[PDB]
Amino acid sequence: YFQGMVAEVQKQAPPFKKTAVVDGIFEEISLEKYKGKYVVLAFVPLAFSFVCPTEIVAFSDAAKKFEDQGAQVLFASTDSEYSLLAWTNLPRKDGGLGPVKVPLLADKNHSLSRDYGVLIEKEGIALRGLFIIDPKGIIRHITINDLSVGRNVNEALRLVEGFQWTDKNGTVLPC
Amino acid sequence: QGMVAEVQKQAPPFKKTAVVDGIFEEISLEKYKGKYVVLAFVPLAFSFVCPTEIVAFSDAAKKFEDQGAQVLFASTDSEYSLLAWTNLPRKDGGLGPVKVPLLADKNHSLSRDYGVLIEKEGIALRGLFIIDPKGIIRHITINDLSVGRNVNEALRLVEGFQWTDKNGTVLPC
Amino acid sequence: YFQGMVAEVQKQAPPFKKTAVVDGIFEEISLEKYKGKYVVLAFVPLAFSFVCPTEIVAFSDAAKKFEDQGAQVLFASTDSEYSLLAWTNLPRKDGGLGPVKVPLLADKNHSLSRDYGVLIEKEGIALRGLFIIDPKGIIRHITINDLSVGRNVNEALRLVEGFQWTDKNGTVLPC
Amino acid sequence: YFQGMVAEVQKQAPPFKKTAVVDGIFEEISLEKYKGKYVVLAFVPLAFSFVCPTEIVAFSDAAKKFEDQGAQVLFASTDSEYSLLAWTNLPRKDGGLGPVKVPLLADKNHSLSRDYGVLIEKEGIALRGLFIIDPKGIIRHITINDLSVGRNVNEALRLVEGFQWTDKNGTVLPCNW
Amino acid sequence: YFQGMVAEVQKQAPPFKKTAVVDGIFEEISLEKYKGKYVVLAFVPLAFSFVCPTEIVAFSDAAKKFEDQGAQVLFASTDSEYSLLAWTNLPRKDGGLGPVKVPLLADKNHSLSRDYGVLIEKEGIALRGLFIIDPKGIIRHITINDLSVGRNVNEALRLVEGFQWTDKNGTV
Amino acid sequence: YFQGMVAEVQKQAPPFKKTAVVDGIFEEISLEKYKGKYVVLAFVPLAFSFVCPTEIVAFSDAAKKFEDQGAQVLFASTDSEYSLLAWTNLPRKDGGLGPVKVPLLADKNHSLSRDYGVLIEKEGIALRGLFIIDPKGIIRHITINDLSVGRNVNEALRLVEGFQWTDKNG
Amino acid sequence: YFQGMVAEVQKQAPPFKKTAVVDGIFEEISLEKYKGKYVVLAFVPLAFSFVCPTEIVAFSDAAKKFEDQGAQVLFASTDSEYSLLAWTNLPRKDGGLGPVKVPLLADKNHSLSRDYGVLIEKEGIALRGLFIIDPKGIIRHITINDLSVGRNVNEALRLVEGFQWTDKNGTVLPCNWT
Amino acid sequence: YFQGMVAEVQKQAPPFKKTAVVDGIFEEISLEKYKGKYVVLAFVPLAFSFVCPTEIVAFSDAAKKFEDQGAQVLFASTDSEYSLLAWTNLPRKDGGLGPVKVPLLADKNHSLSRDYGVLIEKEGIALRGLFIIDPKGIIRHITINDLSVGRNVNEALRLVEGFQWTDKNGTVLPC
Amino acid sequence: YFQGMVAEVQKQAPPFKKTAVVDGIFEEISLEKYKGKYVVLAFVPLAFSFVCPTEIVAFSDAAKKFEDQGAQVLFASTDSEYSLLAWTNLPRKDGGLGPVKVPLLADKNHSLSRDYGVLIEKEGIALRGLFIIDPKGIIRHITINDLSVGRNVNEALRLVEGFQWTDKNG
Amino acid sequence: YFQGMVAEVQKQAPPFKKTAVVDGIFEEISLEKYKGKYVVLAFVPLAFSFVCPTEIVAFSDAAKKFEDQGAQVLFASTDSEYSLLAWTNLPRKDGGLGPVKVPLLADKNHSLSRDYGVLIEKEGIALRGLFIIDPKGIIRHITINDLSVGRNVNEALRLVEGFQWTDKNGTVLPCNWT
């Protein structure tokens, strides 16, 4: 990897070091921290708002399903740490997300959304990306949607599992 | 003019020789404006991994016709390679006569332009792209070569936009 | 506005038409709107920031005075239109900014905090500023103050009163 | 600082060395002279301006308040050291500035007002700029009142005195002073 | 030779390394494997054409007639090595090319079709080329035939014979 | 075709104008002249050389077969027109060649042999190039040999007859 | 003449537009205003200085003599028009300039000196140049001296009246006479 | 001094080395030769040129008045050294110059006039310039006369005797 | 011909218009007036030269010799017309060449000297050049000796004497 | 001569190396070969050209007169090596120049004709050149004639000796003496 590249499947993923909200406190999160696992990132338009984050509630509520089986879930938004933290902090009648079981990252300089070729430059928001990274820092799987349609946590899950297994074995189940 | 197919933007036009029911016919992305399109790439003509996903992929046609969507496969393999790979039976690893167009990107323009081309290897990737009737790409999937994509994801995601784009209104939630 | 520059005193203010939360609704707001009036532009901390009860309340209390004396204030920040809303809805007794009587002008794509050169792209945060802009669009009083300081409402209305006086009639006052 | 950056807050202020009128005699002034002790650099538009001289007198009275806090006041304009020295040497009552307790600067070569962004290129004069410079030579505040309005010395004083708080505490105080 | 060049007569042949089919097994045949020997480099464009490729069977059946003079036969095309392998396993009756004793190089990225300059960049295929490369790696020969017919078998022997006799004895 | 390009199969033939020996006398020959017959444009290395005559006599003697099939035969070289004409005068026993029935184009400034890129520049000579041009100005065949072995008489004639059929039929 | 060029004899003189001190009031002086007369353009380094430079006085009295001979004197400096104005309103005995009958131009933005090549960039003053510019706008004569020494006014008038004469006759004079 | 700038006031005199006619012989004159003296460089229009006999003779005649304050005088032109030679031999009485006691700097490839900027590009002669240089190599005064006004022995010298003294004093000089 | 070239045989020697010494006075000559005749331009090292007046008087002496064959003799040097004029008015005792019968041009500003490529930028002088311009404006001949040898006038227009007869004229 | 200068008087003679027809066989000729002698280089357009080859015969039959003085004659043309061969194998009655006493250089890639700029570039031929070259490899004389007129040998010799004689004493000769 060099600085100046956009993420491209099969190639080294751009590294980060960023402030993050973990279980209600501030923590510094990097890609090197998780090297040795797979790391899943998913993007969303807007904090503290509608659009019905079906997929985010799915992943975060499904966080456990990722953890044991060998995957690491990460969220991201172009907000600052204070908005994300406040939006896990506050209750649901205040428009909160409630506490979640996965690490959340604040990219407030846009570096990540720029890195993976998601950011909408005019709107300062992100399309719906889903990217999967391996323990060597390579991006195995990417899905991207427009902002009217959601995710599938189970598709990503089994695909993760499969790529994991096939890496060590080098085979792939037939058909 | 690197077009670089990207989500929520116009689809790059391409015109490529393709097989429609065992006969040579020119297929462009122009034909179906007004209809959805799912453009899916396969690694190799006569690949070595497994036949019987492929037999299941080639079988699904009516499912995108009911909800008003077109299926297309493309590869950097030649038009002829794809044809002959429909003409070989499945027992030998082939296909047989099938109902889906098989696009030939040998010239590398299409696959390059959508960013699924591996420039060193001159082979396609696991790509899948959804293009709406007005030309905007609403979805893309990419997997690493070794594991296949899923027809069910495409089928679901096309109808999500069927209903939501159809209404013209926000939805609860 | 050349499609260039940054920000400079005198020469006409960079125009913008974006969005804002005015009194809890999203009114489409442009600086074009306020031609014929003075406009005072003020930048604020990130959502859910860390500040005392008095300072913040002050400028909401004087919010009405700009409406009175013949001028319009624009709160703005590199924050998001939705997050800010969340930070007015949440009442003060619970730690939220509470209701404010001025527009909160939302720049999440960094346009506003970019034209005026207050954004340090590393932090994604805007430094304090006061820009006096006449009905003609000319930037006259520049203030970069800095993160920690109160936006002085008596200096802001001193500016409104005095500048408006000197261009409205033309005689200064000595000394 | 690299040779042609226009001054920007939080970054090393452009260093200068310039002819200056101090206490009726010529002296060279540069950033490096003042090291850690703060510096307040203020520009004045014109020597022998028709504007009220009072803006200046107050500054002298406030200089001592800047001194007790470990700060230093400075003045600058595109006028040459003869115009500025002539504008101090004439009594306050006769239309000049008379003697004052604060240094001046002769920018006759127009370097500073550029590098610091307070210059009007066509007029070859300075705006009302105010720069507050730190021990390590960092610009944490700038204010520009255009040309029709002078500055507020109690404002600037709270700003110096008040940034010493954030510096020496290492923290930001929403309500403190 | 700088990289980026096109094949030129009396000059070093552009180096290449590819995957190639040998008797139904993958092998990396590169170029250097054959140093010290004439190297017959032939391109056959995309397969599956009505016209009869009977001439290639003359080479394949005569390849022991060739090899005795110290030559290595190679064909190539822009298909994938799995594609080539499929057209190699398909018998000749049903439109394939079943038997071969000669390596078939798959260059789909075009490095081989592009580097010796037999290419149509828009068609992603070559013309019908042949390059005879001496033991030093120099291109001694260039033939290019159009798409309608093909090349000629005895010509290659006549020329390779000629360059053997002339390169050995010095007399022309 | 654009100027500066090199010829190739399927592409327009470069135009040129050159001094040439025709049945013993100078003439200005240009490619556009012969549009409407096939044209076999070949090159040969040097005047008063050794391998050349026995080869050249082959196509030269065939002039009636190529003019019967509606073709025109041309050789070219970087030697001077004078060297070709004198060559044509020198009789095969003592002579290099003997008089001949086919036009011969001498490019002494070297620009032509550049145009089709068969010229070996460092030596200022040309290989044995073989080009077949149709009435539309398209090259249907190319052969590039080295200097030690001649081409063939039968192959060009067989090829011209071969492409005629596909042109007119299918 | 084009923007950015340096003043050179035999070429069109760069025009000028500047705020100037004319008889106690501000007036903007331009070159097109004098077309039909010669213009003697001069420069002085700094207002409110010592050593009572008398070159200026010489160009004032001699300005009377020019207008008698039909020429126009102009100074200039990059001192601001307030410094110059204050220094004209200032009586001479105090170190001031006293009253003056010639226009005095303010170069405050340095645009003119860069075009006649008399500007000192790092010191921000103008050399002592002397340019005689005719109705056609051409420079026939150049005198540049170091700032420390005054010009000879008598030579200025000598040659000025000189080139008006030679311009009328269209031929050189072997021996100057007065 | 950098090659390509055309002299200036206060700036190093361009170095040059040019064959010169001195008292009927050829000698190499470089300005380095005169380091430690003042040097004066004047340009005469031509050789055998039509000019008043009295004006030309008087200027040449004074090398004593320059020597007495320790200064060297030099004339120059673009003609070849042989033409100027013939003009120093050819008696004044005949309409010529006559013998002359100061070197004659002739440059027929024009270098000198180019370095000092008096080269008239399309003529090939220089106007009447006279330059004063001190025992450093700095240019203290520059006069470019038009070709129709000769020099003034008193105006060329007066400034010289003045610079010797104003420099020598090393003290400020009262009004 | 181009603007900025030097000079080349057959590329039409750069024209000019330049002040010339003619029979003792100044007269304006260009390479125009002589269209229709040949012109021989020749350069000499110096004016007032200390070297060899004899060859010089012998050079000037031939004028009618070029008029009879329809040719015009001009010389050129970097000495000014005021520097070069004085050199025809001086007797031998002072080193004078004498009054001469052929025009002598002063190229002081170097335009020509540089144009024809004989100039030495360092020395600021021209080597002895010779050019023959034909009525049609084409350079038919050029000779350039180094400075140590003059011109054989026989070598000067001998070539002209040949060109008259090559033209055939009838 | 920096490799990409064109032949110019007093500058290093361009180095060149060529196959040549000398006395009925080939050979390699270089400028490097002769260092220590002068060299007189002449061009002629083409082989079996129907302008009279009297210019070539002149120097050739005179080759020894350009020798005893310690000089060497060189001919060059754009012809091939077998073109000059065929052109030396015709006796003069047939239009050829027969055997020759001087080296005949064959430049068929033009490097010599391009180096000295005597190429006619569109036609790939040569004008009639004559150049004088010193032992130190520097061109002190150049003559170009059109194709229509030859090059007098005697004049050329006259130009050959004097340069030698004056190089030896470093003294110029005012008035020439055979």
Curated annotation (Swiss-Prot), chain D:
Active-site feature positions: C52
Higher taxonomy: Eukaryota, Fungi, Dikarya, Ascomycota, Saccharomycotina
KW Ubl conjugation (keyword) present: yes
GO annotation, biological process: cell redox homeostasis; cellular response to heat; cellular response to oxidative stress; hydrogen peroxide catabolic process; protein folding; protein stabilization; response to oxidative stress
InterPro entries: AhpC/TSA (IPR000866), Peroxiredoxin (IPR050217), Peroxiredoxin_AhpC-typ (IPR024706), Peroxiredoxin_C (IPR019479), Thioredoxin-like_sf (IPR036249), Thioredoxin_domain (IPR013766)
Miscellaneous field: The active site is a conserved redox-active cysteine residue, the peroxidatic cysteine (C(P)), which makes the nucleophilic attack on the peroxide substrate. The peroxide oxidizes the C(P)-SH to cysteine sulfenic acid (C(P)-SOH), which then reacts with another cysteine residue, the resolving cysteine (C(R)), to form a disulfide bridge. The disulfide is subsequently reduced by an appropriate electron donor to complete the catalytic cycle. In this typical 2-Cys peroxiredoxin, C(R) is provided by the other dimeric subunit to form an intersubunit disulfide.
Domain of life: Eukaryota
Organism per entry: Saccharomyces cerevisiae (strain ATCC 204508 / S288c)
Induction comment from the UniProt entry of this chain: By peroxides.
Keywords in alphabetical order: Antioxidant, Cytoplasm, Disulfide bond, Isopeptide bond, Oxidoreductase, Peroxidase, Phosphoprotein, Redox-active center, Ubl conjugation
Residue stretches making up the Thioredoxin domain: 7-165
Molecular function as annotated in GO: peroxiredoxin activity; thioredoxin peroxidase activity
One CC-aspect GO term: cytosol
Covalent link location (Glycyl lysine isopeptide (Lys-Gly) (interchain with G-Cter in ubiquitin)): K18, K93, K136
SUPFAM superfamilies referenced in this protein's UniProt entry, alphabetically: Thioredoxin-like
Compartment(s) of residence: Cytoplasm
Major location (coarse): cytoplasm
The protein's Enzyme Commission number: 1.11.1.24
Oligomer and partners: Homodimer; disulfide-linked, upon oxidation.
Known function: Thiol-specific peroxidase that catalyzes the reduction of hydrogen peroxide and organic hydroperoxides to water and alcohols, respectively. Plays a role in cell protection against oxidative stress by detoxifying peroxides and as sensor of hydrogen peroxide-mediated signaling events. Can act alternatively as peroxidase and molecular chaperone. Oxidative stress and heat shock exposure cause a reversible shift of the protein structure from low MW species to high MW complexes, triggering a peroxidase-to-chaperone functional switch.
Sequence similarity: Belongs to the peroxiredoxin family. AhpC/Prx1 subfamily.
Catalyzed reactions: a hydroperoxide + [thioredoxin]-dithiol = an alcohol + [thioredoxin]-disulfide + H2O
Protein name, per record: Peroxiredoxin TSA2
Keyword NADP on entry: no
Swiss-Prot record, chain E:
Enzyme Commission code(s) on record: 1.11.1.24
Residue span(s) of domain Thioredoxin: 7-165
One biological process term in Gene Ontology: hydrogen peroxide catabolic process
Subunit structure comment from the entry: Homodimer; disulfide-linked, upon oxidation.
UniProt-listed InterPro entries: AhpC/TSA (IPR000866), Peroxiredoxin (IPR050217), Peroxiredoxin_AhpC-typ (IPR024706), Peroxiredoxin_C (IPR019479), Thioredoxin-like_sf (IPR036249), Thioredoxin_domain (IPR013766)
Protein name in the entry: Peroxiredoxin TSA2
Keyword Ubl conjugation: yes
Pfam family, one: AhpC-TSA
GO molecular function, one term: thioredoxin peroxidase activity
Reaction catalysis annotation: a hydroperoxide + [thioredoxin]-dithiol = an alcohol + [thioredoxin]-disulfide + H2O
Family that this chain belongs to: Belongs to the peroxiredoxin family. AhpC/Prx1 subfamily.
Locations listed in the record: Cytoplasm
Induction summary: By peroxides.
Keyword terms, alphabetized: Antioxidant, Cytoplasm, Disulfide bond, Isopeptide bond, Oxidoreductase, Peroxidase, Phosphoprotein, Redox-active center, Ubl conjugation
Statement: the UniProt record of this protein carries the keyword Oxidoreductase: yes
Gene3D superfamilies xrefs: Glutaredoxin (3.40.30.10)
GO CC annotations, alphabetized: cytoplasm; cytosol
Primary enzyme class: oxidoreductase
Catalytic machinery residues: C52
Function: Thiol-specific peroxidase that catalyzes the reduction of hydrogen peroxide and organic hydroperoxides to water and alcohols, respectively. Plays a role in cell protection against oxidative stress by detoxifying peroxides and as sensor of hydrogen peroxide-mediated signaling events. Can act alternatively as peroxidase and molecular chaperone. Oxidative stress and heat shock exposure cause a reversible shift of the protein structure from low MW species to high MW complexes, triggering a peroxidase-to-chaperone functional switch.
More details: The active site is a conserved redox-active cysteine residue, the peroxidatic cysteine (C(P)), which makes the nucleophilic attack on the peroxide substrate. The peroxide oxidizes the C(P)-SH to cysteine sulfenic acid (C(P)-SOH), which then reacts with another cysteine residue, the resolving cysteine (C(R)), to form a disulfide bridge. The disulfide is subsequently reduced by an appropriate electron donor to complete the catalytic cycle. In this typical 2-Cys peroxiredoxin, C(R) is provided by the other dimeric subunit to form an intersubunit disulfide. Present with 4820 molecules/cell in log phase SD medium.
Gene name tied to this protein: TSA2
Top-rank taxon: Eukaryota
Glycyl lysine isopeptide (Lys-Gly) (interchain with G-Cter in ubiquitin), cross-linked positions: K18, K93, K136
